[model samples]
Target chain A: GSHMRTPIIAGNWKMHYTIDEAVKLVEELKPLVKDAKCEVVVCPTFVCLDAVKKAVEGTNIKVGAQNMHFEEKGAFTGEIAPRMLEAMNIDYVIIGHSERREYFNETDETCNKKVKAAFAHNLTPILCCGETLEQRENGTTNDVIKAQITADLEGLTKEQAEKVVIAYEPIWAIGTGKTATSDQANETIAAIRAMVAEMFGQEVADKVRIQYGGSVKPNTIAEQMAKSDIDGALVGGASLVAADFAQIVNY
Target chain B: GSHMRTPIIAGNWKMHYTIDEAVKLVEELKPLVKDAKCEVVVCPTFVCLDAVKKAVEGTNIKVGAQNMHFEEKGAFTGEIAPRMLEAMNIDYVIIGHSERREYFNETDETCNKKVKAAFAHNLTPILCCGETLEQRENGTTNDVIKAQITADLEGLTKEQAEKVVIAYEPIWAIGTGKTATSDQANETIAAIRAMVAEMFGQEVADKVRIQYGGSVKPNTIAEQMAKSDIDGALVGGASLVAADFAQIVNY
Candidate 1:
C-alpha cells in the first residue's frame, strides 16, 4: 500500500524553556533540520510560542502549540484559545495528550471539540491516542485505541480527518525507557489505521499520519520508521537539547 | 481601622480581542489611564500579552496574564509559567478566576500552589475567590469566601501577602447589575479584609488590597470605591471597551 504520508517529527517542549533558550534552540536546530525526510514542528508552552514562531521563520521547521482551548475565547482563565493560536499563526495543535488526560482530566469528548476547533481555525490537529500499561497488559490496547479514535474523531469531517495526525503514545512507556519494540508499536498503529478507514473511508484513512511517541529517539527512530505503519515520532526529553533533537529530525 | 491601600483597577479582557485589537486597546487606554489614582493593569489573552505589554511601556499601565500554571515548567501543554511572564517583564497574573474554578475544577490547593509559584518568580498574584449561586443562596457565601481566602493565600508570608491582591468576585448575580450594590459589595470586601486580619494579622490584612470583581462599571465604580473598605475593581465586560475601562480608571 504505497502512500505519500510525509513523516512528521514534533517536539513537545511540554513544560520547558524560557523565551531566550527556546528561540536559541530553534535557531540552532534550523540548519540541521532544513532537509529532513519529513515535516517538523516544535510545540512550546504558550509563553514561548510567539518567540519561537518568529525565530523559525524562513526555515522548513513549522511551529505548533502543545494545547489550546476548544473555544475561540472565554472566561476559562489560563486556557489558550484556538483564535489565540490563530493570531500567533501556529501551524498545528497537539490535543488529548495523556499527561493532560491524567493531570487535568482531558477526555476524548473534549478532544473531539478541540479537533473541530483546530480545523475551524485552519490549524492542523495532531490528535494523540494511546493505551496505558494497564490497558495494554489487560489486552485492551485495540479497544482503547478504537474508543479514543471513535470519540476524538467523532465530529471531524472526512477532509478534516484526512488532515489530522494521530500520535500513538504508550502512557507507561512515556519517559520510562520501556518503549515497545518496533513490531509491537506498528501492530497497534495498524489497528488504529484500520479503524480510521472504517470510520472515515479508506481514502481519508490512508492520508492520516500516525506517529509513535514515548521513549522515541534517534537511535531507534529509523528502525521504527522501518515499518510502513509508523510514519514519524512525537519526540520529547531528547527534544530539549538541540543536538539530540536534530539527530531525530535528521533520521 | 485606617491605612492606605492604594487602589488597584485591573481589567480582565476575558478571552476577547484579536492581537491588533488588543494592542490598539492598550494604546487607546494608555494615555487616558496614565494619570489615574490607582494602579492599572490590563491582562490580554496569551496571544496578545507580548504585543500589549510592549504597547503600554513607558506609561503607568502594567501588563498581566489572565491565567498561569503553578509549575515552573514541563509537559503541561498549553499552560503558561511565571518565568515566561518575568521574561516579558509582566507585572501581575490573575489566578483562580471564578470561571476557571468552576469550569476547570480549580481548587484552593491549586490556587495555593499557583500563588506561591507566582511570588517565587516575582510576579504579583491576583488570587481570585468566590462562591456558586447555590453556595451563596445556601448562606455559605461567608464560608466560601473564608475557605477560598484561607487556602488561596496559604503559604505566603506576611510581607508576600501584603503585596498580593485578592479580587473578590461576588458569586450571586455576577454579570447582572444586582451584583453591584455598592454597600453589598463593600461589606463583603470588608469581611475578606477582616478575615485576612484574623489569618495573617491586622497589619498584613491592612496591607493586602482587595478589589471587588462583580459587575464593576464606571457609573457605579465611584460608589464601590467610595466605601472605606473597597479598594478597587477587577473590571470585566466594561474593561474590553477602551473608553469604558478608561472611565473606571479615571474614577
Candidate 2:
C-alpha cells in the first residue's frame, strides 16, 4: 500500500438498521475503533441518518449515506437530494452500488451525475465499479470496470478525481460471502490504478484510495489491506457487528 | 364528502428542504393546524423524517415519508424499508408518486408491493395514481387510471383496500401550475371508487379515501375538498408554506 494515502473503511449498512439499532451499533463500535488508523465511515439508511449522525458525534467515526439523488432539490419524489445529505453533515456517499444499479434505475450515466453532485456538495464519493459474474466469466471484467470508471468519472478534473475513493466490488462476490482472493483483489485494484494513471496521470492515481468490497471480513481484511493497491474495504454484513467491523477497521 | 371517512391533507414535500428548513416548517405549521378538523400529515424527505417526527410529537401534525421500499430490510442500498418507517412512527408513506414513476423505476407492480408492505407494518400507504397530459387529450385518462388502480390494488383485501388512501394526481398538473377542474377530479375519483367497488365491494369503496393532487393550493383546496368524491388534498408546493397548508387544512 502507498504510504501517502489514508485507508478508508466504510460500512455500507445497506438498507438496514432501525434508529435504535443503528445508534446502539455505533455506540458499541465507538470505543473499539478509537485508535483505528484507517478512516471509518458508517452509512445508514436515510431514516436513520439523523439519529446515527448524532450518535457518532465527537468520535473518529464519520457518517455517510448509502446513496443520494443527483439533483440539489426538485420535484423527484422518493429521492434524497445532495443538499439534504449535505445539510445533515454527511461526509461521504456511496454512488452506484451494484444493488442500486441492479434494482433501481441506476446506470453509469446516472452515477456520473450523482458523483459530480456529491463533489459539488463537498461530500466525498466512494464510486463503486465492478462487473457481474457473467461479465467476469466472459472475460470482460476489465472492460466493464473501465467503461464504468470512464463514464462515471467523466468531466471531473484531477483535483476532484484524486479525492474520489473507488471500490472494486465484483457483483458475484457481493453478499455471497465469496471474496475475491487477496491477489485477485490487488490485481484488479492495480489495474484500476493503472486505468486511473492512464486517464488522470500517475499522481492522481497514487493519491486515490481504492477499496476491495464484497464479503470483506475481519479474517480477510488484513491480507486484502496488505496488498500494494488495496487500501481499504467497503464492508457489508460483517459491518453490522461491532467487533467484526472494528477488527476490519483496526487491521 | 362522506362523513364516514376522515379527511387527510398530506404535504408531499418531495425532494426539498434541509433538516433545519423541514423542522422550521413543521414547527411553524404545528400550532396553525392544531385546531383543524382534518387528519393532517406532512411527508418530508427521509433524512428529515426523524427530526420532523420529533418536531411534530404530541401535536396533531402526523409525520409521513415521501416514499418507501417494499422490502422489510436487506441489501437494497439507498432504500428505506417499511419497518424502519414503522419503528420511527411514520403514519403514512406515499407510493407510486408520478415523480417516482417518471424518474425512478416505480411501476404499478412495485406500488402494489410497497402498499402491501406498508399495510403489513401497520403504516398507511398514500398510493398515488395519475394520467399524463397526453393520455387526457387521447381520452384514455380513465383507462390509464383504471389500469394503475387495478394493478396496484391487485392483492389487497378489502380491509387493506379501505385503509389505502388513493391520491388521483394528473401527471400534467403536478408542479405544472395546471389544476385539474373540480369536476374533472371528482369524475376520475368517482370512477376510481366505482372500480374499487366493482373489485373490492361497495362498502370498501365508500370507506376508501381518495385525495386529489397536482397543483393543489390553499386557493384551490376548498372547491376540491367540497366535491362528493374528493376526500382531501395532497398539497404539493402549497404545503411547503405553513400558512397555505394551514389554510388548506382548515378549509
Candidate 3:
C-alpha cells in the first residue's frame, strides 16, 4: 500500500516577535510558499495570531498559535484556550515542546489535555517529543521518546492519532547550533516510528507523518528530508525568515 | 487640594478571547467610549494584544496586556516581555494580578521586577493588591496589604510611583457576586492610601489613583466612586459587553 504522506514544515516562534513584526514576516513569506509540496505553518507568538491570520488569509501559508490552554475557559490566567485559537481561524497548535515542559513546568498530563483540546476544536496538533542531553548520553533515547509518545498520545483513538504530527527534536540540538547528522536524526526517527507502530499498529504508524526538528537550516534541509522516516521539520530560527523557510517548505 | 481624578474602568480578560474575539469586542466598544470622562482600558490576553491595539486605534480606549515577563527576552517559553508589550502600543499592564500571584507562584519580588519592567517600557501599570478571605478573616488585611505594597514598591522612586494605579480587589470578592460594601471597600482603599502616604510622602499619596475592583457593576459604581479614595474600578464580568462597560465608564 502507498504510505499516507502529508509533509509539514512548522515555524515555532518561541517567545519572539511582536504583532507588527509577525505581520511583516507572514506577508513576506506568503508569496514564497505558494506552490510548496508540504503543508506550511507559522506558529507566531500568541499575541500575533490575529495579524498572522490576516496576513496569510489569501495565501496557502497557515497560521498557528504557539501554545494554548487545555481548558475551554475560566481563570487560567495568562493562557489562551484552544477554543479561543479556533475562533481566530487557527489551523494548528504546537504542543509539548521541550522548552515548555522544562521552563514553564508543562507536564505530560497537561500536554495530553491540550492535544485533546486542539482536536476538540478541530485544530491539528504538532505534538513534540524528544530526549534530553542526559537521556541521550545514557542511551535511553528510545525509552524517553516511547514514554513521551505514550503520555502525550494518551486518551486519543487511532483516528485522532493519525491527525497528529509527531516531531522528534532532540533537546540538545534545538537552538544550539548543533545540527544532528542525517544518520543520527533518521536513526531516532525510525525508532519513533517503530514505537508508534508498537503502540497502535503498523498501519496507523505508517499513516502518521514524523518530522525531525533540530537546527534545520537550508544547508541541512535536503539531507534531513531525504531520510525515510523524516517526513518534514519543526524549524526554530531558520523558519523566522521568508527565504529560509520557503526553501525548507519547497525542499 | 482637590484630587486630580480620572475614572478608570479596566477589564481583566483573564484567559479568555482569541485575537478575533478581542478585536471584535474592541471595535464594538471604541465607538461607545468616545467622549467618556473615565479612562477605559481593555486588558486582553497577551496573544490578542495586536488585534486589540488595531481595533482601538484612533479611539480613547487604551490597550493593556494581562501579564508580562520581567526579562527583556530569551529562554522563557510561554511568556511575553514588557518591552514587547510596549512595542504593540500597549498603554497599560495589569501587574501582580491575584490570579497570576496565586496560580503562577509570582512573588511580590517578581511583581516588583515586573512593575519596573513595565515602567522601563514606558507603559503604565495597574498594580493589583488584595488579601485572601483567610487573611481578611484573620484581621491581617492591613498587614497583608502593607507587606505586599512595601515589597511591590521596593526600589521605585517617587516619580515612578506617580504613574502607578493601585487596584484594591479582595480575593473573595472577585467573581463571587459579593462586592465589598461601599463602606467596606472605601475603608480598605483608604488604608492602602494611608500606607502610600507614610511610605512615599502625603503629596505622592494624593497624586496616585486607587481603584476598587471586585464584582464592580453599574449598581455599585456610583457608591464606589463616591468614596474619596476610590478613584476608579478594575471591572471584571461586566466589562465584557460594550453597554455595561459604557455604564461603568459613565458611572
Candidate 4:
C-alpha cells in the first residue's frame, strides 16, 4: 500500500457475450473509460479475445484471457497458450478463478503452474484466491485464503510475484449478493498483502496490486476502493454493460 | 464402406503455432488440399480459431475447435461455448480428446454433454473415444471402446448421430505409436458402427463417419483408409507442417 502499484480494474466476462456482442461492448467502452485515472482491462472468452483485442487496440484499454493452459504448447487439447496471447499483444490472464476450481478441475498446483507459465511468457496473471460460505461461516477464512495464496503462488520469486495481481474474491459472494461486508474483504485483502510481504518482501508486497472481486457495482465500488489496502476490483456482471463499467472505472 | 460418408482429414493443431504462424499455415494448406476428395478441417488453438476461420473462408476449407463447453453461456470460466464457435462460423469441435481425458479431467459424461451441445447448436461433434495401453494389453480394448461410445453417445438422436464423426484414437498410441494396430482400430471402429447400429439403426450406423487417429502420417493414411470401416484420420504432429499435412490430405 505504501509503494506505487497502479490500481487495475478488470472485467471477467465469464461465458457470456458472442464475438459481435463483445466487439459492440468494446466500442461503447473504449471511449467511456478511456480517460479513467485507474487501469482498466477486460477478460473475454478465448474465441473473441482476438476480436476484442483488435477492437481495443490503439487505446489505453488492455485485453486479458479469463483462463489459459500452463504448458508452452503440446497435448493440452482445447487450451490456449501464453505465446498465443503474447502474439496478439494481450497483456493479462486470470488464473484459478473459483468457477474454474469448482467446475473445471483447477487445483492450487495447477494455478502455480499457470502463474509461472504466464510470467515466463510475459503475460501478467491476475491470481484469484478466497473461501466458500461454509469456510467463512466456520471461521476459516484466513486459513483458506492463506492456503490458496501460498499454494497458488508456490515457487515465485519476489520479482515474479510482484508482476502478479492478487484478486481477493470470496467464493460465497462471487455470483451472489456481495453481502460479506467491505470491512471483512478489506481486512482479508490486507492480510493477503501481508502474506505477500512475508513470502516476498515489504517492497514487493507493496508493489503488488490486489483487487477485490464479487458482484461489484458502480455504487458499491466507491466504498470498497475508499480503503487504504483495497486497490481495485475484479468485476463481474456489472462490467458487461458499458455505462456500468465506465461508472466503476470513474469511481 | 458402401455408404457415402465422405472421408475427412482433421488436423488437430494441439497447442502449437502463433496466430501469425497459424494464418500462414492455413494459407499454405488451403490451396494444396482444396481439390482433394476428402473433407479437410484444421482445428487451431482457441485463441487462433477466429483468425484461421477468416483465413480459410471463401474456399472449401473448414475450421474446427479443439474443445468446447457443453452449455450455451454462463459461469464456466475459460471455456468456449458452441455458440461462440457458431458465431465464428466454425464447422467442427473435437470432444473428449485423449489429452483432455488424461490431463484436463474430461469425463465420458462431460463428453456426452458436449456432443449434445454441439449438435444442438449445429456444430458437428468429432467425438473421440479410445483405450489406454494397459487396457489394450489387458484385453479390455473392446470393453473400453464400447463404454466410451455408449456413454459419450448417450441420448443423441439418429439424425444427430449420423451427422457426428466418431474419432477412435487409443490413448497409449496417440503420440507414441498405434499399438492397437490400424487393423485393431479398423476392427474397433467397425464394431463401434455396429454398436451404433444396435443403439440407433443399421442405416444410421452406415451414415455415421468414423476416423482413426494415432500418429497418422501420410505413409500410413492411405493404407488405413483402405480399410472398409476406417473413413479418415485425426492427424496430429504431422499436420502442423504444411507439406506433410498436404501429403496426408492427398493420400
Which candidate's DockQ is highest? 2
lDDT per residue as tens, model 2, B17-136? 989999999989978988988899999999888889988889988888988898878888888889999998889999999888887788889999999999899899999998988898
Native A-B contact fraction in model 3: 0.55
iRMSD (1 decimal) for each model: 1.8, 0.9, 2.0, 1.0
Q: Between candidates 3 and 4, name the one with more favorable TM-score.
A: 4
Q: What is the C-alpha lDDT of each candidate?
A: 0.86, 0.89, 0.83, 0.88
Query: Which has the higher lDDT value, candidate number 1 or candidate number 2?
Result: 2
Q: Write down the DockQ of candidate 3.
A: 0.48
User: Which candidate's lDDT is highest?
Assistant: 2
Evaluate residue B184 in candidate 3 and report its C-alpha lDDT on the 0 to 100 scale. Answer: 90
lDDT of 3 by residue, B1-251 (tens): 17885668888878777666778888888778897888889888876787678777888988878888888865455678776888877899988888777755678988899899888998998999999988998999999999999999888899998779999988966556566798998899999999988889888898888998787887889888888789889887787777888888888
The CAPRI classification for model 2 reads as high
Q: Chain B TM-score per candidate, please.
A: 0.96, 0.96, 0.96, 0.96
* Residues B132-166, model 1: lDDT tens digits: 77887898888889988888888778989899999
Badly placed stretches (over 4 Å) of model 2 are A174-178, B174-178
Lowest lDDT sum, 10 consecutive residues, model 3 chain B, at B172-181
What lDDT does model 1 reach? 0.86
Mind listing the fnat for each candidate? Answer: 0.64, 0.90, 0.55, 0.86
Task: Name the 10 consecutive residues with the lowest summed lDDT in model 4 chain A.
Answer: A172-181
Please give the distance, in angstroms, between residue A156's alpha carbon in candidate 2 and its true position after superposition: 1.6
Candidate 1 residue-wise lDDT, A134-188, digit = tens: 8988999999899999999997779888999999988856656556889988998
